[PDB]
Amino acid sequence: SNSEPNVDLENQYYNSKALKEDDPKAALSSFQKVLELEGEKGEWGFKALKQMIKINFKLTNFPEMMNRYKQLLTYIRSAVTRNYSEKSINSILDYISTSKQMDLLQEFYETTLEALKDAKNDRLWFKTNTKLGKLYLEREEYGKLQKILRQLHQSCQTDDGEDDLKKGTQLLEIYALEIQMYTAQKNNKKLKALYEQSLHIKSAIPHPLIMGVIRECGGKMHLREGEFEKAHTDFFEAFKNYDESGSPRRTTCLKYLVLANMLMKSGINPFDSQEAKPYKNDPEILAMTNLVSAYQNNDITEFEKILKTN
Amino acid sequence: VYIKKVEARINEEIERVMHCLDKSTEEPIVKVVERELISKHMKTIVEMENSGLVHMLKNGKTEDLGCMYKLFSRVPNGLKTMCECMSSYLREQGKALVSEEGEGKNPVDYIQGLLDLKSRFDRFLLESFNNDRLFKQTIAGDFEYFLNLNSRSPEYLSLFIDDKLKKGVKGLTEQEVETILDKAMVLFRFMQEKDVFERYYKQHLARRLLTNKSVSDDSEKNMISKLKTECGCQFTSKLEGMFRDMSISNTTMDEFRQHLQATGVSLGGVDLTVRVLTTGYWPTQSATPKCNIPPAPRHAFEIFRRFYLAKHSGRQLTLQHHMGSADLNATTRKHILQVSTFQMTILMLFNNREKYTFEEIQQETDIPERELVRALQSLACGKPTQRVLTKEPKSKEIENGHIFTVNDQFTSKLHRVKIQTVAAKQGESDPERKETR
Amino acid sequence: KRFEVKKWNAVALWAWDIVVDNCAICRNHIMDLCIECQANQASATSEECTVAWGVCNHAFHFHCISRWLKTRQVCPLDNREWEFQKYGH
Ligand SMILES: [Zn+2]
Ligand SMILES: [Zn+2]
Ligand SMILES: [Zn+2]
């Protein structure tokens, strides 16, 4: 196929990249000269600006880092593909997240928010809110998380309705944020409401972690009511999602699946091929494995001994 | 001009009868007169073909269709033949466009040309027919008829989406991109033998992802959302897991990056971004070959395999060469080359010792079949004036005893210069592709 | 050297292997016949008793899952409808 991008621009950008390991003051001027000589839109200059932010964040240079990020925000909506742009931006957001200047983190976030609003790119503005939302749940903040959830929900009404038919993808993130919200609060009334609202309209392509979290709440709700088949199914998918992603809660979710599997009065073994293999011999799961072995063998004396021992 | 004249005749007749006669005076006269005038004139004028119904629709006369709809609606059995003639014209237009005879038609242009026809007819329906249900039913039924005619069509359809997704320059705004693909699947619904279409659709979505990244992301999830809304589970869910495994790849690397932050890696592992996918969604390319690995990647793969077998026990990895890329730093300046995990073995042997031939790379490499030849020719055969692997017996065909050299090619002064001629004839046509079909 | 590799972006595929275990319906093993083949039939001549692989990547004896499909059809390890994607190992 081939397509002549530019001969001079790529040379000068990588020349500055070769000078990155040298003194930045000469390199950053060289990167700026690339941007001035960039002229036409800067797929390479976008990389140069991305590298400049990475370099400046090393030597604690925020003032122009966000000002050039605003240039990147305008650079998002000109030529660069959405896939590369938000992957670059997500890496920028993750790279800023490395330090602990949380004030600068959210100043970066709020500048990101309104910029993506302008170019009708609420797709990434939703993702940044989800990125900011997940961070909020980790440190238990709800004052602005609720505002985010309302704004994300506000972007999701089709005026008369409260949901779209393609933003069911978005409602996955919205409810997953709310699932973790009421996990700490232990609000069973909202937990079922979230799950019921989720189930019907969430039908879409989810992120594996989101699906596992949604199903994990459903298994808890079903177990707290009495349904064993539904709780077992929800724990099954949540553990399946955890395996693909790699969340540490997979072992804890497996314990949920084992208990639900034993509660439905079925001799079926909930390890099989789904629960890999080594998880049977895991020290935190070996006690559960012994419970399954005693449950299948109907050894009440051995079962009760394991209950008291562990 | 007759339709305007008869409309005026009705208007003056109804005006006279309500003002010069008694109060009601309208039911018997109007119905019989309207029925006779409309029935005979419509039949005799469409045979004449002198700017009748088919001609006044071909040139795009919005007013003529609008006045015809508002007049023929009063007489029963008028819309029935109106849609029948409209469907017949659509059939004639469809056959002249879905014609299969003649090779050399662009699949992207074929759908796009037909796509404009659907939008043009929809615009006429909205502007003139006032969104009549009968007209919508007939065009929907007609579109179901002429779209599933040819056999070689699901293959062409999947290529149309591939062109749209590969590059978005044509209509940079996502609204134009999404509209083209929105009503494109309207054509998809009117297609029987979905199994053969799915298999073609499975294969090319891999082809979209396995060459270059940075397609769209956000709309890629969006176009998947419409996919599950319209098709079903079994064949489509496999696709939705492929892009899901792409998310699995980076998330698995997020854990791998955490290990990179904790433990520093030596020269075997300077700069690695490995990827982890599941075989349950991503099909095998051709055979998952078993070629050799350069020593620096050998250590990197060994470290990753050891890490994956220690902290991620319960699954073992299989190495392959028909996937990925690399950045080969060459060295008057230092320009980094690019090899898509095909020439890495060939260049590594050259670094160990130059002046090799086809026999050298086929005896001490455990190299697969002609896919080597197609990969080998990516550096020598069919190359522009940016050659990174030259030979003295320059020929299109690849012989056995030919020596390879290297050229500077300062015309390729690009510190990261990429070789995009890797594909070339990878998916060639005729040799052994039709016989296995 | 003249050419040195700095970056590499290979893709490492993983597949659940050593899927030997137990046909959970028969509780004997993934192979070595089933309860309907070691306790039920005695002749076992011109017989088969293969494995049965589904869309959800689960594995059972062909005899065990087919008989389980009489009453229920929901793959008792989940709520999936258990399409039949393969037979044998
Ligand atoms: Zn069995
Ligand atoms: Zn059997
Ligand atoms: Zn299953």
Swiss-Prot record, chain A:
Q: How is it modified after translation?
A: Phosphorylated by CK2 and PKD kinases.
Q: Where is this region: Mediates interaction with NIF3L1?
A: 1-252
One cellular component term (GO) for this entry is:
nucleoplasm
Would I find Transcription regulation among this entry's keywords? no
Instruction: Kindly list the places in or outside the cell where this protein is found, as annotated in its UniProt entry.
Output: Cytoplasm; Nucleus
The protein's superkingdom reads: Eukaryota
- Single Gene Ontology MF annotation: transcription corepressor activity
| One of the protein's GO biological processes | inner cell mass cell proliferation
Instruction: Give UniProt keywords alphabetically.
Output: Cytoplasm, Nucleus, Phosphoprotein, Signalosome
From the record, what ranges are coiled-coil?
none
Please indicate if the UniProt record lists Metal-binding as a keyword.
no
Q: What does this protein do?
A: Essential component of the COP9 signalosome complex (CSN), a complex involved in various cellular and developmental processes. The CSN complex is an essential regulator of the ubiquitin (Ubl) conjugation pathway by mediating the deneddylation of the cullin subunits of SCF-type E3 ligase complexes, leading to decrease the Ubl ligase activity of SCF-type complexes such as SCF, CSA or DDB2. The complex is also involved in phosphorylation of p53/TP53, c-jun/JUN, IkappaBalpha/NFKBIA, ITPK1 and IRF8/ICSBP, possibly via its association with CK2 and PKD kinases.
Q: Which family does it belong to?
A: Belongs to the CSN2 family.
The record describes its quaternary structure and partners as:
Component of the CSN complex, composed of COPS1/GPS1, COPS2, COPS3, COPS4, COPS5, COPS6, COPS7 (COPS7A or COPS7B), COPS8 and COPS9 isoform 1. In the complex, it probably interacts directly with COPS1, COPS4, COPS5, COPS6 and COPS7 (COPS7A or COPS7B). Specifically interacts with the ligand binding domain of the thyroid receptor (TR). Does not require the presence of thyroid hormone for its interaction. Interacts with CUL1 and CUL2. Interacts with IRF8/ICSBP1 and with nuclear receptors NR2F1 and NR0B1. Interacts with NIF3L1.
Which named protein is this? COP9 signalosome complex subunit 2
Q: Which organism is it from?
A: Homo sapiens
In the complete protein, the residues contained here run 24 to 333 of 443
Curated annotation (Swiss-Prot), chain B:
Q: Name one GO biological process term.
A: positive regulation of mitotic metaphase/anaphase transition
- PTM (free text): Neddylated. Attachment of NEDD8 is required for the E3 ubiquitin-protein ligase activity of the BCR complex. Deneddylated via its interaction with the COP9 signalosome (CSN) complex.
Q: Annotated pathway, please?
A: Protein modification; protein ubiquitination
Does Cell cycle appear among the keywords? yes
Residue span of region Disordered: 422-437
User: Among its keywords, does the record have Cell cycle?
Assistant: yes
Tell me the keywords, alphabetical order. Acetylation, Autism spectrum disorder, Cell cycle, Cell division, Cell projection, Cilium, Cilium biogenesis/degradation, Cytoplasm, Cytoskeleton, Disease variant, Epilepsy, ER-Golgi transport, Flagellum, Golgi apparatus, Intellectual disability, Isopeptide bond, Mitosis, Nucleus, Phosphoprotein, Transport, Ubl conjugation, Ubl conjugation pathway
What GO terms are given for molecular function? Answer: cyclin binding; identical protein binding; Notch binding; POZ domain binding; ubiquitin ligase complex scaffold activity; ubiquitin protein ligase activity; ubiquitin protein ligase binding
GO cellular component terms attached to this protein's record: centrosome; Cul3-RING ubiquitin ligase complex; cytoplasm; cytosol; extracellular exosome; glutamatergic synapse; Golgi apparatus; membrane
**Residue spans with biased composition (Basic and acidic residues)?**
427-437
The protein's location, in the record's own words, is: Nucleus; Golgi apparatus; Cell projection, Cilium, Flagellum; Cytoplasm, Cytoskeleton, Spindle
What does UniProt note about where in the body, tissue by tissue, this protein is expressed?
Brain, spermatozoa, and testis (at protein level). Widely expressed.
Tree of life domain = Eukaryota
**Function comment:** Core component of multiple cullin-RING-based BCR (BTB-CUL3-RBX1) E3 ubiquitin-protein ligase complexes which mediate the ubiquitination and subsequent proteasomal degradation of target proteins. BCR complexes and ARIH1 collaborate in tandem to mediate ubiquitination of target proteins. As a scaffold protein may contribute to catalysis through positioning of the substrate and the ubiquitin-conjugating enzyme.
Q: Which family does it belong to?
A: Belongs to the cullin family.
The protein in question is named: Cullin-3
Q: Which organism is it from?
A: Homo sapiens
In the UniProt record, what gene is named as encoding this protein?
A: CUL3
From Swiss-Prot, chain C:
Keywords in UniProt for this one?
Answer: Acetylation, Cytoplasm, DNA damage, DNA repair, Host-virus interaction, Metal-binding, Nucleus, Phosphoprotein, Transferase, Ubl conjugation pathway, Zinc, Zinc-finger
Which organism does this sequence originate in?
Homo sapiens (Human)
MF (Gene Ontology): cullin family protein binding; molecular adaptor activity; NEDD8 ligase activity; NEDD8 transferase activity; protein-containing complex binding; RNA polymerase II-specific DNA-binding transcription factor binding; ubiquitin protein ligase activity; ubiquitin protein ligase binding
Its recorded reaction(s) are:
S-ubiquitinyl-[E2 ubiquitin-conjugating enzyme]-L-cysteine + [acceptor protein]-L-lysine = [E2 ubiquitin-conjugating enzyme]-L-cysteine + N(6)-ubiquitinyl-[acceptor protein]-L-lysine; S-[NEDD8-protein]-yl-[E2 NEDD8-conjugating enzyme]-L-cysteine + [cullin]-L-lysine = [E2 NEDD8-conjugating enzyme]-L-cysteine + N(6)-[NEDD8-protein]-yl-[cullin]-L-lysine
**GO CC terms for this protein?**
Cul2-RING ubiquitin ligase complex; Cul3-RING ubiquitin ligase complex; Cul4-RING E3 ubiquitin ligase complex; Cul4A-RING E3 ubiquitin ligase complex; Cul4B-RING E3 ubiquitin ligase complex; Cul5-RING ubiquitin ligase complex; Cul7-RING ubiquitin ligase complex; cullin-RING ubiquitin ligase complex
Which pathway is it part of?
Answer: Protein modification; protein ubiquitination; Protein modification; protein neddylation
From the entire protein, which fragment is shown?
A: 20 to 108 of 108
Question: Changing residue 58 to A does what?
Answer: Strong reduction in ligase activity
What mutagenesis or variant effect is reported for residue 37 to A? Strong reduction in ligase activity
Q: Which GO terms describe its biological process?
A: cellular response to amino acid stimulus; cellular response to chemical stress; cellular response to oxidative stress; cellular response to UV; DNA damage response; MAPK cascade; negative regulation of canonical Wnt signaling pathway; negative regulation of insulin receptor signaling pathway
The family this protein is said to belong to? Belongs to the RING-box family.
Zinc finger spans (RING-type)? 34-79
- Listed EC numbers: 2.3.2.27, 2.3.2.32
